[PDB]
Each structure stands twice: as structure tokens, then as C-alpha cells.
Amino acid sequence: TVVVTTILESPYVMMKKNHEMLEGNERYEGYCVDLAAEIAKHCGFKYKLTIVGDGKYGARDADTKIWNGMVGELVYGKADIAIAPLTITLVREEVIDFSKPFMSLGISIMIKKGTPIESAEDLSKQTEIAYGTLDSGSTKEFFRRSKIAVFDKMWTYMRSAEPSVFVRTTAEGVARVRKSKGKYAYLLESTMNEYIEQRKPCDTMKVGGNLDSKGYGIATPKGSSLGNAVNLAVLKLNEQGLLDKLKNKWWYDKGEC
Amino acid sequence: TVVVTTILESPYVMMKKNHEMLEGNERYEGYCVDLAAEIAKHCGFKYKLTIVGDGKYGARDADTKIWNGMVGELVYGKADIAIAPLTITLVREEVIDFSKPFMSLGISIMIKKGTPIESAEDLSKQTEIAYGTLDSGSTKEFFRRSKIAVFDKMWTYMRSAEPSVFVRTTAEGVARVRKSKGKYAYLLESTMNEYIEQRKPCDTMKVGGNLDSKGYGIATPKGSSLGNAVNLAVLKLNEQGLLDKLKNKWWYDKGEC
Ligand SMILES: O=C1N=c2cc([N+](=O)[O-])c([N+](=O)[O-])cc2=NC1=O
Ligand SMILES: O=C1N=c2cc([N+](=O)[O-])c([N+](=O)[O-])cc2=NC1=O
């Protein structure tokens, strides 16, 4: 039985309301739960969904050299595959294998409806409306390293803004936008942004085009005997229109706004 | 010296007008020429750019079983690597390996400026403005296989439309949009659509969102000693902003509109 590590991130993997009455894989629902069943069908395996212990995606502590999260579970042999919204990055790709992306995304801007901001350029031209990113990760790194005039200006502002515009978690960034009365905008991944936009109380909005591009992929330990088939399954599912069907299902069909 | 196969497709690879006075890789210019140099540098190999003999991407004859194009050049050992706008697809990944995508794209609609069409649903609700795809390939198959009502409606129309709405080449689909006085819309790659949008006479426009998601990838034979490095180089180039810099350079900085 293949041990699948995943993460409780909506709408990818969520506990069903009546989860206490259920056991195993049936306790969960979501985009990745559906995707897991599809991957298993196309690769011919049985699996057990397990939520990553530390609730993380996966980063390497710079001093201790240790990997946490789902990446850590793969690197250390605790799971056979990770079917979750895990970003395909260079550092991760160096220690684990990734399938081709099953979903594309990029940095975007989330505002509280009513806020007079329509782009990154709008944000950069003022300070009245504070804006920031998660305190660590791809979005923060993008701005810190950017050579582009507009993004570099946003970085100079964010890195010295007081009080701090950085947040510890994505939920905090979304909550800060919602409870800041039009005075805060949050830079986060487009997928999460468009998802929140379809959730009650329907008070947020995604503005402007994506600032960069990246993709989520299914991961397996380096040299895994599942890698090849998993990759082919992703490509097949995309061409069959299934990946798009699942995106529409969990974001819009199940939307509230 | 690595033998790289590529294709003369703008703005990816263009033969400099004064190529006779030039030698080797210096005879060409374009997005893929710049990409080849970056990949070569980040993988530590010397290479020679060659233009695919039959000028094709790579398709397997339903009867002959023979692979044409760049894919054929790889599976038959005529080239070690393909650095071109080669779409990552299931049929091709069955016989060659693809790196993570260096460019994202999807089926899009090209119209003559002024055409009262903003989406696929708009096209599907009328017949006055004819629309079609290349007479063979990915975009045609997308419509033929779709279970989505709008796309199925569009297929039923294109299949029996008279005069024929299918074109022999991409250049013909583009020329047909330009010369049909707003009475023809062309379905093609978003990358090519946005490229043509930046070329004189500046009479075309990309409208609506992409109907699907695909990516271009660097291709190498199965078991290639170049596979791992190439993959890492693509991710690094994306994270350092180089791929976005490259596209902006060839599509917009050099744009004529
Ligand atoms: O791998 C990752 N995947 C992510 C996926 C999401 N997600 O939205 O699914 C988010 N996020 O919530 O912004 C952050 C992420 N950070 C990561 O490091
Ligand atoms: O792999 C391929 N790559 C393509 C790239 C392009 N391109 O973007 O130049 C086109 N197109 O433009 O139609 C068609 C393609 N067809 C293919 O089958």
C-alpha cells in the first residue's frame, strides 16, 4: 500500500464535516483527494492518504541541513509519494523527483473589495495602503532578488515598513486583508487568491496579472519506481481535461460568491 | 560537442540575414538561441545548433509508426537534445524525456481587431464569423475529444463548416484572420497569438482566456546524461527571472506595436 503524504490545505485536502464517522481515505475530500484516486487508477496501486506530521510543505534548515514537511517525508523514506499543491522548485528538485506540473500559478495581489488598487504598479506608487508577503518563501524571495524597477521598489518599501507587513502564515495574510479596512493588500499565490475570492464572506478580490510563474507537481523520492508512471498519468489527465474539470469543481462549482 | 536540434519558428530561431558571413551558432538569433546558450552554460557543455531536417515538431504516423520532426531526430539518434518550442505531450513523453516547462501556454483565440468576439462561448453562439484550427494536431484533437458543452458545440460546427475552416499551416490561419475582414477567428497557441499581436500591421488581437494548459519543454532521449542538469537549469533560470526576461525581450522589447 502506497503511503501518500499530503497537507490540509483547502480545497486540496479537507476533512469532510462528518469525518468522525469515517475512516481512512474516506475522511477526506478535495482536489488532491480526487487527483490521488486518479493517479492511483492510472498507475495501478492502492494507497493510504496521510497528513504530513508537521503540517509543512518542505524547506531545508540552512544550519542543520534537515528537510521538514512533505519533502522531508519523501527524503527520509516516511512516504512514497506526495500528492498536494507542492511547488516545483530547484532546491526541492535536487533532493526529490517531480512530475510535470498539474497546476500552474504565480504571485498575485489580494485586496479587500473597495481598495483602490488594481495592480502591482498601483501598490508601488503609494504607501497609504500597506502591502506584504509571507515572511519566508517563493513570494518573498521573488521581491528580494528582483531586478525589475517596480518589484525592486516594492521590496525596498516592504523590507523596511513599520509596523511589519510580513505575515507568518497564508491564513494570517488573508485575515489581515479582511480585517484591515481597505488598508492592507497581500501578495500570495494566484490559486489561493482565486480560491478565497469564491469563499464567504466574499469580501476579497484578485487584481492584476501574475507577477511570475511556477507550477505544483506530484513528488516521489529520487529514483522511485513510481516516478515514470506518475508523470505520464499527470500528462494524460491534463489532456483528457480532467485537471481543468477538478479545478472548476473545487473553485467555482463549489463556490459561494 | 552536443548536437542540438531546433526549428525555424519566430521568434525562437531566425537565421540572421547576413548568415553567410557568419559561422556556427552565430548564424542564428532568437529566444531559443539565447535559451540554448543559458542551458549550455548551466550544464557545462559545448553544442552545435542544427535546424530539424523536415522542419517539423514531432508526430508519429498512425500507420508507418515513424516519428518525424525533432522527436524523430532524437529517437533515431540524429540529435542529442531538442531546444525549441516543443509542447510537452503524452505521446511524445512515451519516447523522449521532457524537462520541466520553460514556457506556459494554452489554446487561444486570434481575431482581427474589431471582431465582436471576446471568448470561445461567443464564437460558439454564432456562425457569421467563421472559426477553425490547423487541419491536424493538438488544437484540432482538443475540440474533437472535448466533453465540455461549449467546445463540443464548436467542434460540431467546425467539422461540417463550409467553406472549410481548417488551415494547412499556422501562417495560413494568421493570414486568413488578417485577410477575412473580421469574418474569421483562428484557434492557436497563446504564445504565437501574443507574438503576432506585437507584429506589424498590428491588426490582430488575442481575446479570452486559454482553453487549456500546456508547456514547452527541452527534450532529450531516454537515458540521456543531459536530462537531470537540463531540468535543474530550467528551474534555476525561471527562479532568477531569466525566462521572463527572455520572453519580454523577444515578444515585447522587440515588438512593433
Ligand atoms: O510548496 C508549496 N505549496 C504552496 C501551496 C499553497 N497553496 O495555496 O496551496 C500555498 N499558499 O497557500 O499560498 C503556499 C505554498 N507554499 C509552498 O511552499
Ligand atoms: O510541439 C509543437 N510546438 C508548437 C509550437 C508552435 N509555436 O508556438 O510556434 C506552434 N504554433 O505556433 O502553432 C505549433 C506547435 N505545434 C507542436 O506540435
Cβ-based contacts of A238 with chain B (< 8 Å):
212-214
Q: Tell me which residue has cell 531566425.
A: B14
Q: DSSP H helical segments within B170-239, as ranges?
A: 170-179, 190-196, 227-239
Q: Which of A52, A212, A237, A6 is nearest to B241 (CA)?
A: A212
d(CA B50, CA B80): 11
In total, the C-beta contacts within 8 angstroms joining chain A to chain B are: 65
How far does residue B183's CA lie from ligand 2's centre (Å)? 24
Other beta carbons within 10 Å of B206: 18
Residues in contact with A104: Cβ distance below 8 Å, sequence separation at least 6, in sequence order: A213, A214, A215, B104, B213, B215
Cis omega (within 30 of 0) for bond into A221: no
- Evaluate: CB of A189 within 6 angstroms of ligand 1: yes
Residues of B (78-97) whose Cβ lies below 8 Å from A: 88-90, 93-94
Q: Which of A216, A237, A197, A236 is nearest to A34 (CA)?
A: A237
Regarding beta strands B214-216 and B103-105, do their DSSP bridges make them parallel or antiparallel, or are they unpaired? Answer: antiparallel
Using only the alpha carbons of chain A, give its radius of gyration.
19
All 3 cell numbers of residue A186? 497581500
d(CA A244, CA A38): 13
| Domain spanning B1-105+215-254, CATH class | alpha beta
Tell me which method was used to determine the 3D structure. Answer: X-ray
Domain boundaries, chain A: 1-105+215-254, 106-214
CATH domain A106-214 topology: D-Maltodextrin-Binding Protein; domain 2 (3.40.190)
DSSP helix, strand, coil percent of chain B (3-state; round to 5): 40, 20, 40
Please, which residues bridge with residue B124 across strands? Answer: none
Residues in contact with A45: Cβ distance below 8 Å, sequence separation at least 6, in sequence order: A2, A226
Identify the three-state secondary structure at position B51: strand
Overall resolution, Å: 1.8
Matching fold, domains B1-105+215-254 and B106-214: yes
Q: What distances in angstroms separate CA A89 from CA A27, A65, A100, A149, B39, one per listed residue?
A: 30, 17, 12, 24, 17
Cis omega (within 30 of 0) for bond into A201: yes
Q: Whose CA is nearest to atom 6 of ligand 1?
A: A85
CB under 6 Å to ligand 2: residues? B 9, 57, 85-87, 137-138, 170, 188-189, 191-192
All 3 cell numbers of residue B227? 536530462
Contact yes or no for A244 and B213 at CB 8 A: yes
